[PDB]
């Protein structure tokens, strides 16, 4: 309740920081230990859990490096030493994160690991990505980098290994910038590599390391998905444009799920009135500069016909109107067309003498 | 909506209420009558649509009195005050109350004798049927975006 | 053919379904210069922008501009609003509704009445940019 | 273009389905009937150019109700409900539905007996017919230019 | 449903009930200027502030006009009232009042006749600040 | 970002003068005009110019509601002793980014009104001054 | 070839000072004023003039969205020491031939305006400058 009437002066030295943390970027490892399971957050370095083992340690070190700033946050998971990755897999569901690593793994696991992203994406429409070794998933929820033995220090870290600092370099990316040709300083060397046989490499799909220019730098930052059909596009294989569009999608839940999901009639008007509401936010978004203008929202005809067709309505001599206007029973279906800008990453300059 | 039956019975009652004499609603029992009757009756309706469910109503209700003995036509000029009192402003009908915009009366005669008639008009608006569709609360909404 | 008729009219104000409404309109009106070309007899006209006009008129059911735009009109702030407008006559083949938005009112009705008469409310509005969904 | 047979059929159907009583459409079957039967018949059509190809119809079509018993007056006022209930938008003939613009009723007494008169007006749109020559498509084109 | 027909209307002004009145009308006008934002082709407004305007019609059953304002005119010093207005229809389901403070007459009509007429006046008003009461 | 409604209005000003706060005021004002010297330097045909220093302007108009102006300085003037006050204008407008704040110091000013009057016209009292010095606070 | 829609719009331009849009821009306009002698040369009835050199001018308008005069040369300007700033105005409407780009540079303002306002007025504030140097991007 009410105390006597106090003064007080604080004096706090709040100048303590180097390379700040971005607010955006969010790291999830699992792991297989003896001590400290369960997870265990780590949101510098100061704090981290001293019964682990040296390669944990050096796994987390390798994680807690990134491009430009640092990951917001490092979720560590530890598993004991014989066990599924089903559980931890089913705790990390409630739990939100960016990308995921697993730096010790067998062949088996990574088949699970992608079944998962894949059923996640899909399934549940939640946008999530995971790094792994030598998976040759076709998603674009799927990074795989695939060079051998990169001498960082005097350690031939196994590429599994070295996946956790492509997720932290990854993840320290600011938005405006990619990853390629980015240098990495702790890495030495490479194993030998043709340039014809690096560029078909990257051009089946493939994360790499190359030695250009002064040092060691990443050849592109294209994803695992390698055959495009007419409704996905080519710029769905940068790794930059697909986290801009996740972040997006992410975004829009607090939207769409927190009012619009089981709170209102589901009739075309709502439709139309949950249409003008996306469109408006995505207007703020163009004036933001992080998408470019003239963003189009509107009912998705071809999946609704589809919907109608797995009933039993004879899609025949239906009106587009009278097909736009029939009740989908409880599901919505909608369609949206947003573009985003990529790095330079191609010049072609014409001397005249 | 509002029937007319029960503005018709409401006014039936009124006029039994305060009145002696008998009230019919037909023209043979009023011939057979042996005099002094009332005569009820809707006039005409008339219905316009003044917004995409409503519909606006002008009802013209009369009365006749009809005083057969002879030397009978001071007491409808008597009967004229009293129905005055009775419908200056509005009427209730099924919890609902009615405006009267306007009152009119005249003495013509018809046929052999000389009747008074009452009228006046009721104004109200009114909602027409109509369907609705029943649907369920929104529960999955799917949104893909790309170029 | 049949022409379609304004009875089948429906209006969304503010996300709220707008009952009452005896007839809306929305109009662009453009800015031309007069320019003078040498030579030539005619006068031709450049053009240099645009002005969103509009009107609504609505029975006086209940006091919806007050709380609409009342207070925050007294404090200094104006607010602006999306509305949605559908016409649908079942004699026409098709269906279309109009977005408009960043809508700014030019008054507000206290109140207005005369014996013998049923209120009616009309508010002129100015607004910026539309958009167009279910196009015929 | 639309028949209005086809109307009148359409409302014969309709009344026959929602009243049990009979419907006649000429004079001499009303006169022959033992008591409380219908009369259709389409009042009086309007029909004015409004394009170069259609026109501008309006329609009054008028329902009549003649109880000959005596003491149906209140069947009449109750039948009156009923027939509002059905005609309050628009019907559909021939998988075309016509705006209904007012309603209008009134009870006034023709010969002996009081009657009901109910009446309502169709607006809509209507092409009148042309014939029109086929031309086949060009497949020649000659352009002598000079002074 | 059911609109408020305006013959349930009562006003009282100054403190005393109007018994005689036509009708009574009160209204916001909103100012606004027109601004020109580079790069856009819509034309965009700025809202700068509003005037109170309204008027009263009442029959001239007595000398209530002078009695209130006529010699406070006169000598110089101009008088400012309050005034509240009721609309209560039986239909409709609830009632509404308002409280309009600061009024000022625009002006004042001594006599006025007509062979044949009933005499009506009309008195122009101004106000700047409202209160709202049993709102709807 | 820019938009109509952020544009400052004259309406949410209001102005303190010796730390009395006037409710009366119609419009305030406060400029700085530069010194510059031409300078030409051969070889270059575009000439510039050299910085020098500044002077300080500006005026208030106010309503003749009330005789303050007189109270201030009438009596010192004929005396011979000019005094030096120190004004505060607040722009603090709802739709706009916050509100802007400046101190204008060392005033003196120009004139004294003792009367001015019209038949049919309401009064106003107009009274520009000079200033050398200024504080910025509360700067969007 | 000519027509009315060709006609270059100012609704269409954009300005950049010091690097950083201005999005609240109303009006730019810079020129450049010759310097002409007479001489009369005998026999010639016909004066003539001879060029020595130009002087530079010019002035912003913009809306009185944010207090943006200020943070730029407020506090040098007491000190002692003049900033240089660079300005490019580019002219894009897209129905005439593309567009124009110049880049002024040199540009020294010729006073700040502390507080301007009225009541019932929008706030607006011009600055008058003067430049010595340009260059031509893009011209038509």
């Given at each position: 309740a009410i105390g006597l009437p106090s003064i007080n002066i604080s004096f706090k030295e709040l100048a303590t920081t180097v390379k700040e943390r971005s607010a955006r970027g969010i790291i999830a490892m699992v792991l297989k230990d003896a001590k400290a399971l369960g997870l265990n957050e780590i949101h510098?370095?100061?704090?981290?859990?001293?019964?682990?083992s040296a390669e944990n340690k050096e796994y987390i070190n390798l994680a807690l490096?990134?491009?430009?700033n640092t990951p917001n946050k490092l979720l560590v998971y530890v598993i004991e030493g014989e066990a599924d990755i089903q559980t931890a897999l089913d705790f990390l569901e409630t739990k939100e994160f960016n990308y995921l690593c697993m730096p010790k793994a067998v062949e088996a696991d990574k088949t699970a690991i992608k079944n998962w992203i894949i059923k996640l994406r899909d399934i549940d429409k939640v946008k999530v990505k995971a790094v792994l070794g030598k998976v040759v998933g076709n998603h674009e929820g799927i990074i795989n980098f695939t060079t051998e033995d990169v001498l960082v220090g005097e350690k031939k870290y196994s590429v599994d290994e070295f996946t956790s600092r492509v997720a932290g370099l990854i993840a320290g990316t600011?938005?405006?910038?990619?990853?390629?040709?980015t240098k990495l300083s702790d890495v030495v060397d490479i194993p030998k590599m043709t340039k014809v046989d690096a560029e078909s490499r990257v051009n089946k799909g493939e994360l790499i390391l190359i030695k250009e220019a002064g040092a060691i730098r990443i050849a592109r930052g294209v994803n695992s998905l390698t055959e495009l059909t007419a409704e996905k596009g080519e710029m769905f294989q940068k790794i930059k444009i697909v986290d801009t569009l996740d972040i997006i999608h992410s975004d829009i839940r607090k939207v769409?799920?927190?009012?619009?999901i089981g709170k209102v009639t589901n009739s075309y008007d709502n439709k139309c009135l949950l249409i003008v509401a996306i469109k408006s936010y995505l207007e703020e978004l163009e004036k933001s500069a992080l998408i470019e203008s003239d963003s189009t929202v509107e009912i998705d005809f071809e999946a609704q016909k589809s919907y109608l067709k797995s009933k039993g309505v004879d899609l025949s001599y239906m009106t587009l109107q009278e097909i736009k206007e029939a009740n989908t029973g409880s599901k919505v279906f909608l369609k949206a067309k947003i573009k985003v800008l990529d790095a330079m990453e191609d010049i072609d300059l014409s001397i005249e003498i | 909506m509002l029937k007319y039956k029960e503005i018709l019975e409401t006014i039936i009652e009124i006029l039994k209420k305060n009145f002696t004499e008998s009230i019919f609603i037909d023209d043979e029992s009023v011939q057979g009558s042996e005099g002094s009757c009332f005569f009820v009756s809707i006039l005409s309706v008339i219905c316009t649509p003044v917004m995409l469910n409503t519909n606006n109503k002008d009802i013209v209700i009369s009365i006749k009195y009809l005083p057969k003995?002879?030397?009978k036509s001071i007491r409808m000029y008597e009967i004229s005050d009293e129905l005055n009192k009775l419908f200056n402003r509005n009427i209730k009908v099924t919890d609902r109350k009615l405006n009267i915009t306007k009152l009119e009366q005249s003495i013509k005669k018809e046929e052999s004798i000389y009747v008074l008639n009452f009228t006046f008009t009721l104004n109200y608006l009114d909602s027409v049927y109509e369907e609705d569709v029943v649907y369920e609360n929104m529960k999955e909404i799917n949104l893909n975006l790309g170029e | 053919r049949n022409v379609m008729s304004g009875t089948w009219g429906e209006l969304w104000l503010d996300g709220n379904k707008?009952?009452?409404?005896?007839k809306f309109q929305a109009k662009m009106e453009f800015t031309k210069e007069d320019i003078i070309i040498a030579g030539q007899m005619g006068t031709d006209t450049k053009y240099m922008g645009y002005k969103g006009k509009g009107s609504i008129t609505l029975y006086h059911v209940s006091s919806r501009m007050h709380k609409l735009i009342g207070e925050k009109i007294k404090r200094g702030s104006e607010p602006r609003f999306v509305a949605i407008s559908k016409l649908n006559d079942p004699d026409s083949y098709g269906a279309e509704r109009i977005a408009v938005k960043n809508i700014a009112f030019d008054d507000l009705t206290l109140a207005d009445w005369e014996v013998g008469v049923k209120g009616e409310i009309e508010a002129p509005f100015t607004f910026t940019e539309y958009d167009f969904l279910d196009i015929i």
């Open positions: 510098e370095k100061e704090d981290i859990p001293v019964d682990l490096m990134g491009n430009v600011p938005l405006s910038q990619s990853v390629t040709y769409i799920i927190d009012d619009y | 003995p002879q030397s | 707008v009952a009452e409404v005896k």
